[PDB]
Symmetry: C5
Subunit: 310 residues, 5 copies
């Protein structure tokens, strides 16, 4: 068998789609191979290295009746665009190949249930067409990976890896597979500032209602604080992804709605007790409401942690 | 006639469009066929199996003057993209074919009137071009179907099937048709949490208004609860599909609007009776309102069930 | 001249664009023609009918130096995609042609001023390239039209027609034109439920304000009902098309805004009369307001009917 | 030099993009030219005029070694789609050419500062490749322009023109340029109904606050009218183009916000004077507020006219 | 080595994408080169300059076995569209080349943390394929740059530059690189009018609450001013870019929310002190609130300046 050295490098992640579950990149694929049948002596005044396009070089190989180690991108989505496809040929028969491209790729491992605390997995598979007794992939050391970013991005890359495996077609011979994989995360700082801090203030305004004496005014104030929560919710709607299943962020907001609505219902009942002449009993229930309100939020937090992270 | 064995497998459902009524996939089409005229003996040192691209192989067939069993995708929409198209040729004349693609498909059976409790039907048709006395489709057993999903999705597949039929063109000979079909559903859990629970609380706040004594304050509170319902409605608008016809979900929300508006009108009339000095009569009508309000919702639920599910 | 029989059938209307004024379809074009110069006798064991692709068949015609009746789609927009293009050739020289496609088409007749009560006209033109003394179109009977729909759609087709005309280029010979045209409408049921019923309730709440005694409370209630109308308006914005000209629906909503705003202004003036000590006069004007409010809506309806439907 | 007669006609304006500054059309390009070297005598039974596709005809010209007057579209954007490209050849050597297309075009002259009272300029440039001593453009009279529209549109065309100029490349010979240009406007009727009338009512409600006696109630009413203005503003947001610079419409709405906010601040100060026991002074300032409020709007209108239209 | 003179000019910036980090243009690439092997004498009556398309000219070079100085666009994104590709050939062997195109380009340097006061960097790289001892780039003086704009735009260009560098592939010979770069900014005038002025008025209304005597009314007014801020926030949402990280504009709006919410909480506590009979102490704390409110905004401004601009 003949050894083929291969590597892949990604310049830039050009987009990520959370609803369709795919991602897009710009990158470069490189292969080194040696074929002694291609060795030559340069003509008088000719340079020491010959250069062809892939279209030009494949004709040369067909005129010599030489087999090319062809390969394919197994999780590609749609059409792929090439910026350049270039070949250098050595005096000794060494072939150096390079192709540079733009493309989209399938991402079947995406899972957003722990949003915004989620970490996602990305990969690209390259497959040999011929079986492993003709051609065997070897890992080109030093080349493969991701380049550095230059401004400010949405996703932060945490880990990068490459390894070699096999695949099979037509129930015959196994063939080589090359894998590049990486992991990435969000800026949690941004969600603290945009969502948590203002919701905590809204929660505080609802608690402060128990500090006043007239139940009539309380009903007005509690009602208005529920409309304020709803108004805020649509103001953040563009930061929430459109998914047909439940997230941690969804559970948090619905639970806040439930507790704030219950404050309206309680103050109506305290007014009813006052109208029936049971002021002292209503005054006693008020004292229990003040202390149990923060305990309800603390026990809800604990519940969400158990259901989503264990 | 000559037997052609065929099968189709879908890796991933890459999108679903409810307004245009189409869907998109990535998959693989496989065909086995035997043609003794293609049998050969391998050259000294040559492998036991020959491999060509479809473009290369069709030239070989034309040089031998052999007919190829050509086929077409009958509900395809737009252009189809190919990732690979590959042929293996056996010593005995057996041809193995494989094509891997991305494409969109028409979906004329979609019907969303029972949303969110709806179940939808999907299919793909593959048609033979030549008539059934030249070539006959046979079902390749073990291959066809859907692969497993790996994270969390919007639609859950409930059933998968394949079968064989016929089609006709130019009022001449019948020709074979191959069908793959499947059924899928939503996560109802998500709609319970996002829509039902908060609407039930809003309905409860409107009922609690009948517990208070001053009709003047009631009018204020009932009015504000109607604006709260409208505000909530636009907060959920992104979860509702843009269709030009009536759904079960539409009927549910309009009915809730009607009943909450009627509470405003009733409390104005009770205030009018008080101003004309008919307090005792107004106090009697109030007692009938308290009990009939929940009965109206229960009888509305029953009505919706009859109109949509029977 | 030589007779060419032609017909067109549409499977599915794949989209309609109200702002750009175009529509999209999937369909099939069929032509029958006879050319005795193409008659043949089948070889020993050959089938009685020969089959070619369009690319293959045109070469045969060029080798025999035979003219093909070429045609073009005159209101096509953009690029057209072909799913299949197929030819059957009879022993007697009869040619049967079929092409199946996806495409978008221009729609210059669209006019939405009577929305939602509007009915729109659609058409497709097919033109012969050669003049009518070489080739003449004849209508293929039984084939042309629209197929049946299978679930639930936005637009309902009301009428379908085909006929033959002529066109002219280079101020020379007239040439044949084939026309398919159809008409379609909306589900008015949907707009009754989504728009009319809730607006009628909002109008009723504004009338009920005249039933109360304290002008001070009336000003509060009338003001809040105007904000409720504005809130509802944005909740329906996605059902309204984005057009740069006036519709019947636009006129209806602006008129409702005018009348509800005038109720706020009137109640402020009644409070001013009370402050200046003219209660009896203010009480008299109130009685005229109660009866004239419904008359204003009835006379507005009559006005809109005259301006838009006559 | 050889005279080339040229003309251009546009059927339909298929879209206009205000943020990207481009427009799209469907149209037809026509050229007449005479070349005696192409004269011929028709064969026995042949028609008097020969017809070719552009691909076919250019081969004929190359076999005779004849130069074709090639041209290019100088402000084209992206790819252009052709529906038909057709050639008629006369017995005397006269060539008649026709191409029919869909395409997008650059629009660098767009300027929206006077919105909605703006009038915009559109153009298309066609350039000769060869210099003017080989080939000279002449204007084909009677053909060029715009066709009639058939329903109801967003933009109304006010003026259409064509003329001839020159261009230069490689600092050598001047070459011909053909220009078609036109001007268009909006329906102002639509903006009167959708924006002006309701804003004028909101302005009137704010003035009516000065007619009441209790400053306490005034503060409530003035505050609520400011929230009503904000609510209305988002209801019209879809009619406003997304531009990164100031328009006349923007200035109008911000000025209305400023004046309505100032009414809230004034009524708080009048309440402060009442609390400090200076009722008579506060009552005097109220009389000045009533008359100066309409004068502020009149002087603002005058200011906007001077800044934008002079 | 052979000198190649190169230059690039951009007509129009056709779009800018802040979320994907790319931009689009229309422009023209020009190259001058001399090759004595191409010198010729013109035939009797032939013009003094020959003209070919790139496809035509490359054939001529292959028939003479002459090497072409090929090049590539190194940060191109997707497919590039050509409007024209043209060659002039001089009697003395001088080649003049021109290509005119539409395309999108990668923009990895974008960084929006200082929005709206940000200034962004753009560039385009052109790379030689052959190494620098065959061909060397030289800068074509007078040609390169940006053209003038004609109406009103979103971005204003502040600086333009070109320079020459090198690049390396296959660890062999260095090759030439040509760079064009430019810088651009926003209209700050627009953001002053749309965001700052109305927020400053909202801030002023919240301060004026401390001028009134009844804490009961203050709580109502402070609550309503918080809902007004939230309503305004969604009215401007379309002017804010959708980025997953914190901007200066984000920090400004969250800080305003915090301070306005704190006014609601303070007035509830002053009412509690009044109910417990500590009016004089509450009256004293009120005097400290009036002066410290503006100081909080001034010190917040200073803090934001330090964190973002130093
Ligand atoms: C960070 C902004 C969103 C906060 C969501 C928190 C809801 C879940 C509470 C339990 C968190 C468990 C620790 C990870
Ligand atoms: C599940 C969230 C939406 C609930 C809609 C229920 C409206 C229909 C009531 C009758 C249901 C009949 C049982 C399927
Ligand atoms: C059907 C929902 C919209 C109703 C619009 C009615 C406004 C026009 C009133 C006059 C109608 C004339 C009869 C067609
Ligand atoms: C027509 C609807 C928008 C009205 C905008 C008017 C603001 C400018 C006032 C001065 C107009 C000057 C006359 C053209
Ligand atoms: C210009 C409209 C937005 C204003 C944002 C100002 C917030 C930052 C305050 C400190 C500015 C420092 C001077 C550049
Ligand atoms: C979180 C809701 C607290 C409600 C406080 C009032 C409780 C009233 C209940 C009366 C029936 C026991
Ligand atoms: C949180 C809502 C509290 C509702 C309490 C209802 C208690 C019902 C008691 C009935 C006694 C007559
Ligand atoms: C669901 C609406 C209940 C209305 C309660 C008040 C009924 C008043 C009707 C007076 C006329 C009979
Ligand atoms: C739900 C609205 C109740 C309206 C009841 C109106 C009854 C009209 C009676 C007229 C008697 C003078
Ligand atoms: C539809 C508006 C009705 C207004 C009712 C009050 C009329 C007051 C007018 C006083 C001046 C004649
Ligand atoms: C619908 C608004 C009614 C306004 C009536 C104004 C009447 C002005 C009369 C002035 C008398 C001093
Ligand atoms: C348009 C704003 C009018 C304000 C009316 C009240 C003026 C009060 C000013 C007191 C200080 C001179
Ligand atoms: C439109 C707002 C009016 C504000 C008037 C303030 C006048 C300050 C005078 C201070 C005197 C103590
Ligand atoms: C910006 C918030 C100002 C709050 C004014 C009232 C302060 C009350 C604090 C009482 C506890 C010290
Ligand atoms: C800005 C909010 C002010 C809250 C002040 C709380 C002070 C707590 C003192 C407790 C004394 C019993
Ligand atoms: C339905 C799950 C209840 C979650 C309560 C939310 C509490 C979160 C505390 C931070
Ligand atoms: C117009 C149909 C009335 C439907 C009433 C809604 C009641 C739903 C109860 C769950
Ligand atoms: C400006 C046209 C006035 C239209 C009034 C609307 C009344 C509609 C009654 C159904
Ligand atoms: C900042 C420019 C002030 C414009 C005032 C608006 C008045 C318009 C009167 C119709
Ligand atoms: C969290 C950063 C606090 C910023 C306060 C905003 C003050 C801006 C003054 C113009
Ligand atoms: C801003 C937080 C104040 C907490 C007050 C607690 C009173 C018991
Ligand atoms: C939260 C549900 C309370 C139900 C109260 C019923 C009173 C009759
Ligand atoms: C009277 C107020 C008591 C506050 C207790 C708070 C316990 C969390
Ligand atoms: C729900 C319609 C009630 C109509 C009341 C009419 C009173 C004059
Ligand atoms: C006085 C309250 C009676 C509650 C009856 C509720 C019947 C559903
Ligand atoms: C509807 C316009 C009324 C104008 C009233 C003017 C009072 C001075
Ligand atoms: C006192 C109420 C009279 C109601 C008259 C209604 C006429 C439409
Ligand atoms: C419109 C600004 C008024 C400032 C008033 C200041 C009072 C101390
Ligand atoms: C007492 C009201 C006077 C109204 C004057 C209006 C001047 C425009
Ligand atoms: C009694 C009002 C005092 C105002 C002081 C303002 C200091 C910024
Ligand atoms: C990832 C865990 C999700 C569980 C939801 C209850
Ligand atoms: C699917 C049943 C719909 C019936 C609507 C009344
Ligand atoms: C279709 C008639 C429209 C007339 C508008 C006044
Ligand atoms: C077109 C004139 C604009 C001037 C803006 C002040
Ligand atoms: C550009 C400086 C950003 C720092 C954010 C704290």
């Amino acid at each position: 068998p003949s050894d083929v050295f291969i590597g892949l490098k990604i310049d830039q992640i050009t987009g990520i789609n959370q609803k369709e579950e795919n991602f897009s990149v710009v990158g470069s694929l490189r292969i080194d191979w040696r074929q002694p049948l291609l060795a030559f002596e340069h003509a008088p005044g000719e340079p020491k290295h010959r250069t062809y396009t892939l279209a030009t070089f494949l004709k040369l190989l067909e005129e010599k009746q030489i087999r090319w180690p062809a390969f394919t991108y197994h999780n590609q989505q749609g059409r792929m665009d090439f910026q350049n496809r270039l070949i250098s040929l050595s005096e000794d028969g060494t072939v150096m190949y390079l192709e540079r491209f733009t493309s989209t790729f399938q991402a079947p491992a995406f899972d957003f249930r722990l949003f915004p605390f989620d970490n996602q997995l990305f990969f690209i598979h390259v497959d040999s067409i011929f079986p492993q007794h003709l051609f065997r992939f070897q890992e080109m050391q030093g080349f493969s990976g991701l380049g550095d970013q230059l401004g400010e991005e949405e996703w932060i890359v945490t880990e990068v890896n490459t390894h070699l495996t096999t695949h099979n077609e037509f129930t015959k011979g196994d063939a080589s597979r090359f894998v590049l994989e990486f992991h990435a995360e969000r800026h949690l700082n941004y969600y603290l500032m945009r969502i948590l801090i203002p919701v905590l203030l809204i929660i505080t305004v609802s608690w402060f209602t128990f500090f006043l004496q007239d139940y009539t005014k309380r009903i007005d104030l509690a009602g208005g604080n529920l409309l304020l929560f709803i108004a805020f919710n649509f103001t953040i709607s563009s930061d929430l992804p459109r998914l047909g299943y439940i997230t941690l962020m969804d559970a948090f907001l619905v639970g806040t709605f439930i507790i704030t609505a219950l404050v309206v219902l309680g103050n109506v009942w305290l007014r009813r007790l006052e109208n029936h002449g049971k002021q002292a009993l209503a005054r006693k229930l008020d004292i229990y409401a003040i202390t149990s309100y923060p305990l309800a939020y603390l026990l809800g937090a604990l519940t969400l942690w158990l259901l989503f992270f264990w």
